[PDB]
Design an enzyme around this catalytic site. Structure first.
Site, PDB file in Angstrom:
ATOM      1  N   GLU A  90       0.792  -1.238   0.000  1.00  0.00           N
ATOM      2  CA  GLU A  90       0.000   0.000   0.000  1.00  0.00           C
ATOM      3  C   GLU A  90       0.817   1.277   0.000  1.00  0.00           C
ATOM      4  OE1 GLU A  90      -3.017  -0.208   3.328  1.00  0.00           O
ATOM      5  OE2 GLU A  90      -3.711  -2.120   2.464  1.00  0.00           O
ATOM      6  N   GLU A 129      -6.168 -10.771  -1.139  1.00  0.00           N
ATOM      7  CA  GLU A 129      -7.111 -10.539  -0.030  1.00  0.00           C
ATOM      8  C   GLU A 129      -8.557 -10.396  -0.536  1.00  0.00           C
ATOM      9  OE1 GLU A 129      -5.779  -7.246   2.342  1.00  0.00           O
ATOM     10  OE2 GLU A 129      -3.629  -7.614   1.972  1.00  0.00           O
TER      11      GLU A 129
END
Length: 315
Positions: free
Chosen positions: A130, A241
């Site tokens: 991220e 995810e």
């Protein structure tokens, strides 16, 4: 078993909590369905090392031992992130950022510690998670998130994280992992970052699409396009995810089944690069999003939804 139905395509994975691997009810399901495990929290930086030198290996050791024991290889989640990370890595507790030298030394020491302890079981790592900014990035503004890491070291800190992981296990596949991975502006930025990494000679093997989608999601067209974009720069893609949240009705139930079915079509059509699709949590009960949101292919009682049979049996 989902892993079996997709034997010829990619691994089917799941991210686990302490119970998921200690309760025989949950274990039965995990072992039936998945051939890849990620620690949901046990391997992040703060859980494993909240103060410099003071390790807490207990939770991750359990999941890894579960994985050794049953012959499943793990994704290592993550080596570096702006969240769930001890302050000490990048600032001095007065609240002053460290120099690029100390920050680097911290990131190195941590990565050596964890990669070394689980390299027997871990086949790939989310090395940086991220780091790309969220959309709207105006022309000439930075494309990277303005975290403390970025404030200290700029983009370089990413290249280093990867160098350190590679030196600690040269046979591990090394991924950059991010969310909103099918959005048109953000995928471009994610592509651009990985392109600069390769041109600097950084050892990056793959991209991780988090795939926290919803039922208005991004469209399957955007996903397809995004997997095609990333394919022009790496040999390896993972969904890391995966989640399809609703925000239960039977028309919502429908919307979310269609969505799963159509997604897995796209993925199937990209098997060549797609090595692994991992689900975040085993069931709606464990889901970080909650039971309301009704993500994931198993329900509050760990029972397969109908949507599970749709995705399992295809063409």
């Amino acid at each position: 078993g989902l892993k079996d139905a997709y034997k010829d395509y990619f691994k089917i994975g799941v991210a686990v909590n302490n119970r998921n691997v200690a309760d025989p009810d949950q274990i039965k399901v995990v072992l039936r369905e998945f051939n890849s495990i990620t620690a949901e929290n046990a391997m992040k930086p703060q859980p494993t090392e909240p103060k410099k030198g003071e390790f807490n290996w207990e939770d991750a050791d359990k999941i890894a031992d579960f994985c050794r024991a049953n012959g499943i290889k793990m994704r290592g989640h993550t080596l570096m992130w702006h969240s769930q990370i001890g302050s000490w890595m990048y600032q001095d507790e007065k609240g002053n950022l460290l120099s690029k030298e100390e920050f680097y030394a911290n990131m190195k020491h941590h990565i050596q510690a964890i990669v070394n302890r689980y390299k027997d079981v871990v086949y790939c790592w989310d090395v940086v998670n991220e780091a790309v900014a969220d959309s709207p990035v105006y022309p000439g503004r930075p494309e990277l998130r303005n975290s403390p890491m970025y404030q200290i070291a700029g983009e370089e800190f990413i290249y280093k994280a990867f160098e350190y992981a590679h030196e600690a296990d040269p046979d591990a596949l090394l991924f950059y992992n991010d969310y909103n991975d099918a959005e048109p502006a953000k995928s471009q930025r994610i592509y651009n970052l990985v392109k600069r990494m390769k041109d600097a000679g950084v050892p990056i093997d793959g991209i991780g699409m988090q795939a926290h989608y919803n039922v208005y999601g991004p469209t399957m067209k955007e996903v397809d396009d995004a997997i095609k974009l990333y394919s022009t720069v790496v040999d390896h893609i993972h969904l890391t995810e995966l989640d399809i949240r609703i925000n239960v009705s039977d028309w919502e139930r429908t919307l979310q089944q269609d969505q799963y079915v159509q997604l897995f079509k796209v993925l199937r059509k990209h098997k060549d690069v797609i090595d692994c699709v991992t689900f975040w949590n085993v069931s709606d009960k464990d889901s970080w999003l909650g039971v309301r949101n009704y993500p994931l292919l198993f329900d509050e009682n760990y029972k397969p939804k109908q949507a599970y049979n749709a995705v399992k049996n295809f063409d």
